[PDB]
Amino acid sequence: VDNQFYSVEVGDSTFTVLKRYQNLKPIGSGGIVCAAYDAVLDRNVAIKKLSRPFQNQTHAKRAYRELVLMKCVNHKNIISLLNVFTPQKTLEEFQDVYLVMELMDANLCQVIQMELDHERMSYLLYQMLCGIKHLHSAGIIHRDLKPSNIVVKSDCTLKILDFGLARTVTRYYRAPEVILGMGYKENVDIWSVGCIMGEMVRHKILFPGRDYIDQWNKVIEQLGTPCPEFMKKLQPTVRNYVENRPKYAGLTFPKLFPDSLFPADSEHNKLKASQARDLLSKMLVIDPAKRISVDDALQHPYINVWYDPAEVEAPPLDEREHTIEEWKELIYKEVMN
């Protein structure tokens, strides 16, 4: 049963996988990820090694939620699992989980460093929004979208790699309502998409900062101090702190995103430029009550040329604390079924 597996050294770690997976190359560390050729499917795959994911509750809750959710969702813009396995034979010896998905070519950090035409940028954006809408329809509100957890192929197809934060580290993309602990709804994810869109245009992180204080300052000093209605939705403590900040009017969007940042040589590109700038202005809106929704962003002219009911309207529960040993059991049952 273990002769089904072989081991190879990859850097500082050891991968022990099914024999079907061949010629492993490292493509990411931080679990460990390898590219591989899969002889049964005749295609390339990415193999992720979770080492002792039950070693603490943070690793374990995340790993478990991820595994479970991969069955609560089938959609081309979201990560899909081809295979799950462990080389260990019994609950007692169990250590590692390996997860296999289709191999993609790049993450969004890499694409952000490139200039893109409007057709590519808009298609990428459309796919993000489709994936999010599918998620929201399943009751999953992500709240942690970022360029590092989105991946693309050379043909511009896109996938979201994880399922976000639970109902209960890079933070530049987190919504104001998250950063300020204020409660949220579906369009909390529009903010992050706006941060990503804005970065793709400017080639610079919009709201960089070593901590949330820093981040909040970078947000208001560019977008302006938000309205009184927004302030009055904050808790006494946080509202105090946010209202006693140096005030700002902020800048308009032609100044935040000058005409020289876009391709605007032809009439096609001049028009798409102003339309891009319009969508940004509906997305980077501090007050969730005034921020565009996902359905409305899909209907926007910059995005809607791609619209397709098939992709947009595809069909769609406890969260609790446990010890290490209980997590190890929960997780092992999920990889074994």
Ligand X SMILES: N[C@H]1CC[C@H](Nc2nccc(-c3cccnc3Oc3ccc(NS(=O)(=O)c4ccccc4)c4ccccc34)n2)CC1
Which residue numbers are catalytic? 144
State in angstroms the smallest separation of the CB of 218 from ligand X.
27
Is 31 known as a binding-site position?
yes
Residue 236 burial (CB count, 10 A): 7
Are 160 and 203 contacting, i.e. CB atoms less than 8 angstroms apart?
Answer: no
* Three-class SS state of 51: strand
Q: Output phi, psi for 279, to 5 deg.
A: -55, -50
Q: CB 35 → ligand X: shortest distance, Å?
A: 6
Between strands 83-85 and 21-28, the pairing is unpaired
Between 18 and 27, CB nearer to ligand X: 27
Q: What angle do CA 10, 16, 20 make, to 5 degrees?
A: 105
Torsion of the alpha carbons at 166, 53, 70 and 184, rounded to the nearest 10: 10
C-beta of 89: minimal distance to ligand X in Å? Answer: 22
Does 32 show up as a binding residue in the annotation? yes
Minimum CB distance to ligand X smaller for 103 or for 197: 103
* 30 annotated as a binding-site residue: yes
Nearest distance from residue 85's CB to ligand X, in Å?
11
Tokens 């957890």 belong to residue: 149
Residues, the chain, total?
337
Rounded CA separation 147/279 (Å):
19
Smaller CB separation from ligand X, 99 or 129: 99
Q: How far is the CB of 78 from ligand X (least distance, A)?
A: 11
**Which lies closer to ligand X via its Cβ, residue 103 or residue 292?**
103
- What is the C-alpha separation between 312 and 27, in angstroms, rounded? 31
Positions in the binding site for ligand X (CB under 6 A): 27-28, 33, 46, 48, 62, 66, 79, 99, 101, 103-107, 151, 161-162
Asked if residue 79 belongs to a known ligand binding site, the reply is no
Q: Phi and psi (nearest 5°) for 99?
A: -130, 140
Please tell me whether 131 is known to bind a ligand. no
Residue type, 142: H
Is 11 assigned to a binding site?
no
**Strands of the sheet with 21-28, listed across from one edge:** 21-28, 32-38, 43-51, 96-102, 83-85
**Smaller CB separation from ligand X, 83 or 88:** 83
Please give the annotated binding residues, written as ranges.
27-33, 48
Q: Which residues are annotated as a binding site for ATP?
A: 27-33, 48
